[PDB]
Amino acid sequence: DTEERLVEHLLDPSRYNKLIRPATNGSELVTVQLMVSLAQLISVHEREQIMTTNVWLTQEWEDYRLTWKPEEFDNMKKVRLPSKHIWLPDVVLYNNADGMYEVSFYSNAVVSYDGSIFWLPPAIYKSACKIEVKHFPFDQQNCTMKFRSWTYDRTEIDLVLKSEVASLDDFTPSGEWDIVALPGRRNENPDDSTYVDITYDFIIRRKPLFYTINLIIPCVLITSLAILVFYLPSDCGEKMTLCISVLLALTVFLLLISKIVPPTSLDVPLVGKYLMFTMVLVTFSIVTSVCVLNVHHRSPTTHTMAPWVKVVFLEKLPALLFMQQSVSEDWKYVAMVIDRLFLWIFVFVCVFGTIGMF
């Protein structure tokens, strides 16, 4: 029964006002020791540059008008209170999307007899961290979280850390994303001198297997067919089909990968780069291949193929280590020669690019 009397004595509207803050001896600052405790990293939406987490941030401070005599009140060293009626320092994100800053539940608050207070409510937070996307999927993202009041300043409160690292004891594995470090730093401005903030910097690494399987393997597997249409004979009447199909599949994969990543024109990933390059390559291939096909399907009556071709190509034969040769047959052989030359330089350039990636 005493609890009732004690409470209804503490929160008396006449004795205790909430709209003000506890101060004495010359407007001394009230310290606010806060530390965050993660629970799980729900999601990281790249396309929108957002991160959804669940968090319990423990605040602690001191109030000089919430004290009592324990022996009077049947030796009570501790009580619960509602966190709407007592004072409390406003503390939220600043980089928040959804325009939702404050916490959700507004839990109870512990109170001792020395006046201390220890309050931790839960929260789901939608932070906005910028995605550095160059080594996709093997990337190390870096998501920031601010904390500072938005009613008071440094000349009325002073925030402090308790542990330089964000606790992780109640954390549940996330699957995709895996943490590395959770540093937390206090920050202050000398030019302003009224800007105190706490910044926690989650460092995350992605597990690559999923996107590897679903994107990379098909990608490389398909682009491995661009250096091959040259080894196909022009009598089949099929080079166009293969080349076209490859180009279209390639464009599709490109659009898709550009969908999965955000539209930040600041940096470009590696995969889209490689894909654009090999696309340019394969279109050069299609045009040179149509030229080859035309020269192959020429007849004697229509063209004479006067000197230059004869000597130039029937003498270029050995430089390739390609060998040893009715006019239509000579046409066909010229075509064979030129296509093999192009095949050589194309495989060379493919290896060159694969090196360029390292």
Partner: protein, 362 residues
């Protein structure tokens, strides 16, 4: 005289000197017993891609206080009354496993006083939990989703939960159609956290549920299985036609699409991998190898003795191979031969892989 008049007098006497935020106990050492339970109403959605679970659930709590007592013979034989849950004590019951939710009931249905201090409360709720999704035997999958209720600011020496029924009631369950609840158990537990020294209790409800596999079996796997018979067949197709690589490319692109489409329905967890994606991947591998070997063939066939040469040893080798194959300068005949010998090996390989992959499960 009127029951309503006595009801007023009672209700007005009870709430004269009451304080919500005061715990309802006479001796500080004494604890209250919060009998607890659930009753599903439906299972709205289970989002695999985001790993979430939505439930509509009728929470059930009951306890006993020492101030909301009276005598019924003095107030015209009334024992039970109904008052809002906004004027009395109401415990803090939370689920630590929320994801885009509210952490507590926001509907605040009324409460039933029972003349002996006993009080009973049944507010509805829509809860969004996050349960890890294991996907290997897709679609024949048994999922296991959890919900961890418990108190926030009250230790075990002030509050102590009690599970009413060890199973989740399903009297008004609404068949969702795709997911069925095999079983749903409720466990009691305790823990100790870093914040503090005291121990805190908790209750853990586990739903083990199954997926009805007809839909994805009818619309997703049958076509990917039906266009895999055509992976090895191109070899039985000659070279004079000109329709080999067409078939091969079509099959390759189709399988790539089906894989790139199923990646939309499953999460991006890397711990495990489904059994369908892996099979489709092996198939795509072997079919691109097939396009390579068949272009090599096509090149062989269309050769000519003047342009090309060096059938030095191949004569003996292939005229010695053809009898074993029970098949009796010919660029055409050796092409036929090599085609057949690769066809046999590839049918063997597709057979053996499709087989040795699905066996350990069954």
């Amino acid at each position: 005289e009127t029951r309503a008049h006595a009801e007023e007098r009672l209700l007005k006497k009870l709430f004269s000197g009451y304080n919500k935020w005061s715990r309802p106990v006479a001796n500080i050492s004494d604890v209250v017993l919060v009998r607890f339970g659930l009753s599903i109403a439906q299972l709205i959605d289970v989002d695999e891609k985001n790993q979430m679970m939505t439930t509509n659930v009728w929470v059930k709590q009951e306890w006993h206080d020492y101030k909301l007592r009276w005598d019924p013979a003095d107030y015209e034989n009334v024992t039970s009354i109904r008052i809002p849950s906004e004027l009395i004590w109401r415990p803090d019951i939370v689920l630590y496993n929320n994801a885009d939710g509210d952490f507590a009931v926001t509907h605040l249905t009324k409460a039933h006083l029972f003349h002996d201090g006993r009080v009973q409360w049944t507010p509805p709720a829509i809860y969004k939990s996050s349960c890890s999704i294991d996907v290997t035997f897709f679609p024949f999958d048994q999922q296991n989703c959890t919900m961890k209720f418990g108190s926030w600011t009250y230790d075990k020496a002030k509050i102590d939960l009690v599970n009413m029924h060890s199973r989740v009631d399903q009297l008004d369950f609404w068949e969702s159609g795709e997911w069925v609840i095999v079983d749903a158990v409720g466990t009691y537990n305790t823990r100790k956290y870093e914040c503090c020294a005291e121990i805190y209790p908790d209750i853990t409800y586990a739903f083990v549920i199954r997926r009805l596999p007809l839909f994805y079996t009818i619309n997703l796997i049958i076509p990917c299985l039906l266009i895999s018979c055509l992976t090895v067949l191109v070899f039985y197709l000659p070279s004079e036609c000109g329709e080999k690589i067409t078939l091969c490319i079509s099959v390759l692109l189709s399988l790539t699409v089906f894989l790139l489409l199923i990646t939309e329905i499953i999460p991006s967890t890397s711990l495990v991998i489904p059994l369908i994606g892996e099979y489709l991947l092996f198939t795509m591998i072997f079919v691109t190898l097939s396009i390579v070997i068949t272009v090599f063939v096509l090149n062989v066939h269309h050769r000519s003795p003047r342009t090309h040469t060096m059938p030095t040893w191949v004569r003996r080798v292939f005229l010695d191979i053809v009898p074993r194959l029970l098949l009796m300068e010919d660029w055409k005949y050796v092409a036929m031969v090599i085609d057949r010998i690769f066809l046999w090996m590839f049918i063997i390989v597709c057979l053996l892989g499709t087989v040795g992959l699905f066996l350990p499960p069954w």
